[PDB]
Amino acid sequence: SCRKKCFDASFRGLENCRCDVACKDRGDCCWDFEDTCVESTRIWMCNKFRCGETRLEASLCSCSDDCLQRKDCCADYKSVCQGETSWLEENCDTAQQSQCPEGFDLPPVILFSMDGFRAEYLYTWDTLMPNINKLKTCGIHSKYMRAMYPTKTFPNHYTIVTGLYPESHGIIDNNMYDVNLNKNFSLSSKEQNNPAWWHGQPMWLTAMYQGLKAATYFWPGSEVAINGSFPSIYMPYNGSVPFEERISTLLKWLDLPKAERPRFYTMYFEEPDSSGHAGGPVSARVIKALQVVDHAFGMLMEGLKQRNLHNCVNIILLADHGMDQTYCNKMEYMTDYFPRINFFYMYEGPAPRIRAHNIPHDFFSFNSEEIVRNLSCRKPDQHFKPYLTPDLPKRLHYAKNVRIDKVHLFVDQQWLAVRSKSNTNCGGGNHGYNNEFRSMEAIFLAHGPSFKEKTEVEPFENIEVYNLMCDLLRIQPAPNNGTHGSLNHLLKVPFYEPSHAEEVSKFSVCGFANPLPTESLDCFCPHLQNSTQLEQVNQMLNLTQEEITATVKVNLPFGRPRVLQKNVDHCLLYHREYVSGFGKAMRMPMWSSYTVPQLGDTSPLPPTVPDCLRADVRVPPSESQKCSFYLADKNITHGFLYPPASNRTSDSQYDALITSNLVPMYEEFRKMWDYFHSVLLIKHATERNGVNVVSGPIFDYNYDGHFDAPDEITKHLANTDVPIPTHYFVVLTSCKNKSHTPENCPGWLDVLPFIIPHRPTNVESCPEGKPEALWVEERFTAHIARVRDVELLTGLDFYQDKVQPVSEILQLKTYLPTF
Ligand SMILES: *[C@@H]1O[C@H](CO[C@@H]2O[C@@H](C)[C@@H](O)[C@@H](O)[C@@H]2O)[C@@H](O[C@@H]2O[C@H](CO)[C@@H](O[C@@H]3O[C@H](CO)[C@@H](O)[C@H](O[C@H]4O[C@H](CO)[C@@H](O)[C@H](O)[C@@H]4O)[C@@H]3O)[C@H](O)[C@H]2NC(C)=O)[C@H](O)[C@H]1NC(C)=O
Ligand SMILES: *[C@@H]1O[C@H](CO)[C@@H](O[C@@H]2O[C@H](CO)[C@@H](O[C@@H]3O[C@H](CO[C@H]4O[C@H](CO)[C@@H](O)[C@H](O)[C@@H]4O)[C@@H](O)[C@H](O)[C@@H]3O)[C@H](O)[C@H]2NC(C)=O)[C@H](O)[C@H]1NC(C)=O
Ligand SMILES: *[C@@H]1O[C@H](CO)[C@@H](O[C@@H]2O[C@H](CO)[C@@H](O[C@@H]3O[C@H](CO)[C@@H](O)[C@H](O)[C@@H]3O)[C@H](O)[C@H]2NC(C)=O)[C@H](O)[C@H]1NC(C)=O
Ligand SMILES: *[C@@H]1O[C@H](CO)[C@@H](O[C@@H]2O[C@H](CO)[C@@H](O[C@@H]3O[C@H](CO)[C@@H](O)[C@H](O)[C@@H]3O)[C@H](O)[C@H]2NC(C)=O)[C@H](O)[C@H]1NC(C)=O
Ligand SMILES: *[C@@H]1O[C@H](CO[C@@H]2O[C@@H](C)[C@@H](O)[C@@H](O)[C@@H]2O)[C@@H](O[C@@H]2O[C@H](CO)[C@@H](O)[C@H](O)[C@H]2NC(C)=O)[C@H](O)[C@H]1NC(C)=O
Ligand SMILES: *[C@@H]1O[C@H](CO[C@@H]2O[C@@H](C)[C@@H](O)[C@@H](O)[C@@H]2O)[C@@H](O[C@@H]2O[C@H](CO)[C@@H](O)[C@H](O)[C@H]2NC(C)=O)[C@H](O)[C@H]1NC(C)=O
Ligand SMILES: *[C@@H]1O[C@H](CO[C@@H]2O[C@@H](C)[C@@H](O)[C@@H](O)[C@@H]2O)[C@@H](O[C@@H]2O[C@H](CO)[C@@H](O)[C@H](O)[C@H]2NC(C)=O)[C@H](O)[C@H]1NC(C)=O
Ligand SMILES: *[C@@H]1O[C@H](CO)[C@@H](O[C@@H]2O[C@H](CO)[C@@H](O)[C@H](O)[C@H]2NC(C)=O)[C@H](O)[C@H]1NC(C)=O
Ligand SMILES: *[C@@H]1O[C@H](CO)[C@@H](O)[C@H](O)[C@H]1NC(C)=O
Ligand SMILES: [Ca+2]
Ligand code: NA
Ligand SMILES: [Zn+2]
Ligand SMILES: [Zn+2]
Numbered sequence: 021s022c023r024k025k026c027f028d029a030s031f032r033g034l035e036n037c038r039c040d041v042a043c044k045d046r047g048d049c050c051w052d053f054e055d056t057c058v059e060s061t062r063i064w065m066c067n068k069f070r071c072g073e074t075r076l077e078a079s080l081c082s083c084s085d086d087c088l089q090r091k092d093c094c095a096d097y098k099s100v101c102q103g104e105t106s107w108l109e110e111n112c113d114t115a116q117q118s119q120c121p122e123g124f125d126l127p128p129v130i131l132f133s134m135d136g137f138r139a140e141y142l143y144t145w146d147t148l149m150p151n152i153n154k155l156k157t158c159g160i161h162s163k164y165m166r167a168m169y170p171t172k173t174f175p176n177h178y179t180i181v182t183g184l185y186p187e188s189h190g191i192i193d194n195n196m197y198d199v200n201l202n203k204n205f206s207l208s209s210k211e212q213n214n215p216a217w218w219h220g221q222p223m224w225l226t227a228m229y230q231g232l233k234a235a236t237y238f239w240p241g242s243e244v245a246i247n248g249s250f251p252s253i254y255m256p257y258n259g260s261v262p263f264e265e266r267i268s269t270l271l272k273w274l275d276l277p278k279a280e281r282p283r284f285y286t287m288y289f290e291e292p293d294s295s296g297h298a299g300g301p302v303s304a305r306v307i308k309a310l311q312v313v314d315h316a317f318g319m320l321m322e323g324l325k326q327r328n329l330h331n332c333v334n335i336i337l338l339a340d341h342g343m344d345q346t347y348c349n350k351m352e353y354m355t356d357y358f359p360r361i362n363f364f365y366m367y368e369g370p371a372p373r374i375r376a377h378n379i380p381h382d383f384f385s386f387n388s389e390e391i392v393r394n395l396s397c398r399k400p401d402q403h404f405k406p407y408l409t410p411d412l413p414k415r416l417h418y419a420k421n422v423r424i425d426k427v428h429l430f431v432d433q434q435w436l437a438v439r440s441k442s443n444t445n446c447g448g449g450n451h452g453y454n455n456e457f458r459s460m461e462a463i464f465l466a467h468g469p470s471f472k473e474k475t476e477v478e479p480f481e482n483i484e485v486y487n488l489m490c491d492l493l494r495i496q497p498a499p500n501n502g503t504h505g506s507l508n509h510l511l512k513v514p515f516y517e518p519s520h521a522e523e524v525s526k527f528s529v530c531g532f533a534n535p536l537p538t539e540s541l542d543c544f545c546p547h548l549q550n551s552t553q554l555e556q557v558n559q560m561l562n563l564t565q566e567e568i569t570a571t572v573k574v575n576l577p578f579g580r581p582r583v584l585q586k587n588v589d590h591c592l593l594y595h596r597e598y599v600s601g602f603g604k605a606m607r608m609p610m611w612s613s614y615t616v617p618q619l620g621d622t623s624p625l626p627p628t629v630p631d632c633l634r635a636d637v638r639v640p641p642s643e644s645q646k647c648s649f650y651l652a653d654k655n656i657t658h659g660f661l662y663p664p665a666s667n668r669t670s671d672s673q674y675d676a677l678i679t680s681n682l683v684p685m686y687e688e689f690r691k692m693w694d695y696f697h698s699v700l701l702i703k704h705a706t707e708r709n710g711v712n713v714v715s716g717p718i719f720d721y722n723y724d725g726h727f728d729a730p731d732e733i734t735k736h737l738a739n740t741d742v743p744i745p746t747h748y749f750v751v752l753t754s755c756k757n758k759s760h761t762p763e764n765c766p767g768w769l770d771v772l773p774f775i776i777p778h779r780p781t782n783v784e785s786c787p788e789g790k791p792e793a794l795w796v797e798e799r800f801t802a803h804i805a806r807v808r809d810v811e812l813l814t815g816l817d818f819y820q821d822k823v824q825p826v827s828e829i830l831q832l833k834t835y836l837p838t839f
Pocket of ligand 2: 535563
C-alpha cells in the first residue's frame with residue numbers, strides 16, 4: 021500500500037504497486053493510493069486512510085502523529101484517530117469555569133450567524149442537523165428570535181451587534197439613497213464601505229474600546245472602518261471561501277497566544293439563505309444547505325472539544341431573518357395604479373419604498389402624500405397597504421431617518437410589489453416582510469459556561485442580543501434599544517441586575533375643596549337643574565380615605581404609572597370606577613386606569629349620555645379644558661378616555677362626564693375608539709376573567725418613538741395650548757392564570773398593548789361603508805405593540821408596585837403579542 025509512501029517514485033509495494041503521480045496513467049497504483057495521497061490533501065477530516073499519515077505539503081489539515089504539537093490537526097482527529105468520543109456523541113455535560121483551560125479566565129464569545137435560517141427549519145428538520153440539534157438539546161434555545169423590519173440581511177446583522185433599530189444605526193435596507201450625502205448604498209458598490217452610513221457602536225468595537233480584541237469572519241459592517249476603526253482582525257468578504265476554511269481560521273485564532281487572542285468572535289454563513297432563494301424554504305436545495313451548515317458547525321464543536329473549549333466558550337447561533345415562498349402570480353404592479361410611473365423610483369420586493377426619480381433635486385418636492393393617497397383602497401383585494409412612514413405601526417420603529425423614504429408599502433404574506441410586469445424576480449424564496457410573519461422568524465441558540473442548560477425560553481427580539489453579549493464579556497454596553505436585564509433568565513449569574521426607574525416628577529394633590537365649580541367652563545348639563553342637584557353629584561367625586569384605598573386596590577392593582585418626564589406637574593383623580601393621572605399643563609390625563617370585570621351578560625355598552633358635561637371641581641379652571649374649545653375648533657371634537665357608559669351603578673356615569681376625562685378626538689377616530697370600548701373591550705374582559713385598562717394620549721410629532729416635549733408639539737386645540745395627540749395607547753393587563761382576576765393575581769401578568777394612530781380619516785382600514793364590526797378590531801390588531809413602546813412614547817413606567825423580580829417585569833414589558 022501507499023501509507024507513508026506518497027509520491028515516492030522509489031517505492032515498490034505489493035506486486036510492485038506504485039505510489040507516484042505518474043502511477044495513475046500506468047494503472048499500477050496501490051489500491052489505497054487515491055484516498056491516502058490525492059484526496060487526503062483536499063478534505064478537512066481524518067479517516068482510516070489518513071490516521072498516522074506522513075505529512076504532505078498541500079494538506080488543508082493534518083492527521084499525522086505530531087499534528088497536536090504543531091496545532092494543525094483536523095477537527096475530528098482525536099475521535100477518528102485516537103478513538104476518543106466525539107462532541108456529538110458525548111452526553112450533555114455542564115459547562116462551567118472548571119472546563120476552561122489555563123488562560124481562558126474570561127470565556128470568549130462566538131457570535132455565529134447562518135443567514136436565512138428560518139426558525140421553522142430548526143424544528144421540522146431537527147434530526148437532519150445532528151450538531152445544531154445537540155446544541156439545541158444541551159444549551160439554551162428560544163422558540164424563535166424576532167428580527168427587525170425590513171427583514172433584510174444588512175439591517176438585521178448590524179442591529180444584532182449594535183442593539184439599535186435600523187432607523188438609528190442607519191442601515192435601513194440593503195439598498196438606499198441618502199440625500200444629504202447624495203450617495204447610493206448597495207452591496208455591489210464600494211459605497212457600502214463608506215463609514216458615513218454606519219452609526220452606533222458595533223459589538224467588536226464595544227469590546228475593543230474596553231480592552232478585548234475582536235476577530236470577525238464576514239459580518240456585515242466588519243470590513244468598514246466604523247467610527248474610524250476596523251476590528252482587531254477581519255476578513256474581506258468573499259462568499260466563495262468554503263465554510264470549513266472559515267471554521268478552521270476561527271480555531272486558529274483561538275490557538276493564538278493569550279496576549280494576542282481575541283475574546284469576541286463573529287462567524288457568518290450565506291446558507292441557508294442562498295438555497296432558500298433558489299428553491300424556496302421547502303425544497304431539496306434548502307435541505308442540502310441545512311446539512312452543509314450543520315456539518316460546518318459540527319466541525320467547530322469538534323475542534324473546540326479537541327482544545328478543551330467546548331464547555332468554555334459562550335457561543336450564540338442565530339440568523340438575521342427567516343424565509344418565505346414567492347409566486348409570480350402573487351405580484352402587484354404599480355402600472356395598475358398609475359398611468360405614468362416614469363417620475364418615481366421604486367425599491368421593489370417584499371418591503372418596497374418609492375421616491376422621486378430625479379434625485380437629489382426632487383427628493384423633497386416629491387409629493388409622497390399623493391402616491392400613498394393614489395394607492396389607498398384602489399382594489400378591494402389589493403395585497404399591500406401604502407403608508408407614509410409616520411403612519412406605520414409604531415412597533416416597527418421604521419421612520420426616523422432621511423434614508424427611509426416617506427412612501428412605504430406594507431406587503432401581504434408571500435406577495436411582491438414591483439414597478440411593472442417587466443420584473444421577474446419571483447418564483448423562488450424571499451424575505452423582508454413584516455417581522456411578525458412566522459416565516460420571517462429567526463433561530464437563536466446558545467451554549468456555554470455563562471448560559472443556563474437544557475432550557476427553552478420564550479421568543480425575544482434581536483435588539484436584545486447586544487446587551488446580552490456585553491454581559492457575557494462583562495463590559496458596558498453603548499446606549500441601545502435593548503432593555504438591559506430582559507435576557508437575564510438566559511444567564512446562570514446575571515452580570516447586570518436591573519432596578520425600577522425612580523420617578524422624576526412627583527405627584528401633587530388636586531383636592532376636593534368646594535363642591536361647586538368656580539367656573540362653568542362653557543360646559544352644559546341641563547339635566548342638573550339647580551345647584552342642590554349639582555352638589556349631590558359632585559359629592560360623588562369626594563371620596564373618603566377608605567374609598568380611595570378601595571378604588572386604588574381594584575383599579576390600580578399594579579401601582580400607579582410613574583412619570584419619568586422631568587418638570588411635569590400632575591395629580592391623581594380618584595373615582596369609584598377609575599383612577600387617572602392628570603397632566604395639568606396638557607389639561608388632560610396622561611393615563612387613566614380602570615379594571616373591567618368579567619360580566620354575565622356580554623351585552624354591548626349603550627352610548628354615553630349625550631348632552632351632559634361639567635367642570636371638575638378638583639381641577640382649577642386654568643388647568644381644565646373648556647367645552648367651548650371643541651365648538652371653536654372645527655376639525656376636531658372631544659372623546660372620553662374612560663368610557664362613561666361602562667358605569668356599574670345607576671348614577672356613577674356622572675363621575676366620567678367631567679372635563680378631566682376629556683381628550684381631543686377626530687370624529688372618525690372617535691367612532692373607532694367608541695366601538696372598541698363598547699364592544700371589543702367587553703370580549704377581552706370575559707375572555708381574560710376581567711382586564712385592567714390603562715389608556716392615555718401620545719404625542720410623537722417628530723416620529724422618533726419618544727414622548728414629545730411641549731415645544732415639539734405642532735398641533736393644538738382651537739387657539740389654546742391643549743395638545744392634539746398623534747396616538748392613543750391602550751394597555752390591557754390581566755392574570756396569566758385566567759383563574760384569577762387582575763386584582764387578585766399573585767403570579768405572572770399577561771399584556772395586550774395597543775398604540776392606535778390618531779388620524780382624521782379611517783382610510784388605513786378601507787372601510788368602504790362597512791360596519792365597524794368588520795374592520796375596527798383588524799385595525800387595533802395591526803397596531804399592537806410592546807409595553808416598552810408605550811413607555812418610550814409616554815414617559816411613563818408601569819407595574820412598579822407589582823411584587824415580582826424586575827428582570828421578569830422587563831420580560832413582560834418587551835413581550836409582543838402575535839397573531
Ligand atoms: C349606567 O348609567 C346609565 C345612564 O344613566 C342615566 O344617565 C346618567 C348620566 C344619570 O342621569 C342617571 O341618573 C340616568 O339614569 C343607566 O342607563 C339608564 O337607566 C335608566 C333606568 O335605570 C333608563 O331609564 C329609562 O329610560 C327610558 C328611555 O328610553 C324610559 O322610557 C324609562 O321610563 C320608564 O321607567 C321609569 C323608571 O325607571 C318610570 O319613572 C317612567 O315613568 C317609565 O315607566 C326609564 O326612565 C335610561 O333610559 C338608561 N339610559 C341609557 C342611556 O341607557 C344604566 O342603568 C347605568 N348602569 C348601571 C349598571 O347602573
Ligand atoms: C367631602 O366629604 C366629607 C365626608 O367624607 C365631608 O366631611 C364633612 O366635613 C364637614 C366640614 O368639615 C364636617 O362638619 C364639621 O365638623 C366639624 C368637626 O370636625 C371633626 O370631625 C369631622 C368629621 O369626622 C372631621 O372632618 C374633622 O377632622 C374633625 O375631626 C365641626 O366642628 C364643624 O362645625 C362642622 O360641623 C362634617 O362632619 C364632615 N363629615 C364627615 C362624614 O366627615 C366634606 O365636607 C366634603 N368636602 C366638601 C368640600 O364638601
Ligand atoms: C469613536 O471613537 C472615539 C475614539 O477615537 C471615541 O471617543 C472616546 O470616547 C471615550 C469615552 O466616551 C473617551 O474617554 C473618556 O474621556 C472622558 C474625558 O476625559 C472621561 O470622563 C472618561 O472617563 C473617558 O476616559 C475618549 O477620550 C474618546 N476619545 C477621543 C479621541 O475622542 C468615541 O466614543 C467613539 N464613538 C463611537 C460612537 O463609538
Ligand atoms: C434607540 O437607541 C438610540 C441610542 O440610545 C436612540 O437614539 C438616540 O436618541 C437621542 C435622542 O433622540 C440622541 O440624542 C440627541 O442628539 C441630538 C443631536 O445629536 C441632541 O441635539 C439632543 O439634545 C440629544 O442629545 C442620540 O444621538 C441618539 N443616538 C443614536 C446612536 O442615534 C433612539 O432614540 C432609540 N430609539 C427608540 C425608539 O427608543
Ligand atoms: C474568492 O475566493 C475564491 C476561492 O479561493 C479562496 O481565495 C483564494 C485567494 C485562497 O485564499 C483560498 O484559500 C480561498 O479558498 C478565489 O478563487 C480561487 O483563487 C485561487 C487563487 O488562490 C485560484 O487558484 C482558483 O482557481 C480560484 N477559483 C475560482 C473559482 O475563482 C477568488 O480569487 C476569491 N476572490 C477574490 C476577489 O479574492
Ligand atoms: C392621482 O389620482 C388623481 C385622481 O384620480 C382619481 O383617483 C385615482 C386614485 C384613480 O382611481 C383615477 O382613476 C381617478 O380618476 C389624479 O388626478 C386625475 O388625473 C386624471 C388623469 O390625469 C384626470 O383626468 C382627472 O381629472 C384628475 N382628477 C383630479 C381630481 O385631479 C392624479 O393625476 C393621480 N396622480 C398620479 C401621479 O397618478
Ligand atoms: C391557576 O389557578 C387555579 C386556581 O387556584 C386557586 O388559587 C390558589 C392560590 C388556591 O387558593 C386554590 O385553593 C384555588 O383553587 C389552579 O387550580 C387549582 O390547582 C390546585 C393545584 O395546585 C388544585 O388543588 C385546585 O383544586 C385547583 N382549583 C381549581 C378550581 O381548579 C390552577 O392549577 C392554576 N394553574 C396553573 C397552571 O398553575
Ligand atoms: C443613485 O442611483 C440612482 C439610480 O436609481 C441614480 O439615478 C439617476 O439620477 C440622475 C440624476 O442625478 C438621473 O438623471 C438619472 O436618470 C437617474 N438614473 C436612473 C436609472 O434612475 C442616481 O444618479 C445615483 N446617484 C449617485 C450619486 O450615484
Ligand atoms: C332643586 O330642584 C329639585 C327638583 O326636584 C328640588 O329638590 C327643589 O326644587 C330644588 N332644591 C332646592 C334645595 O332648592
Ligand atoms: Ca417624539
Ligand atoms: Na368641534
Ligand atoms: Zn440575510
Ligand atoms: Zn436573502
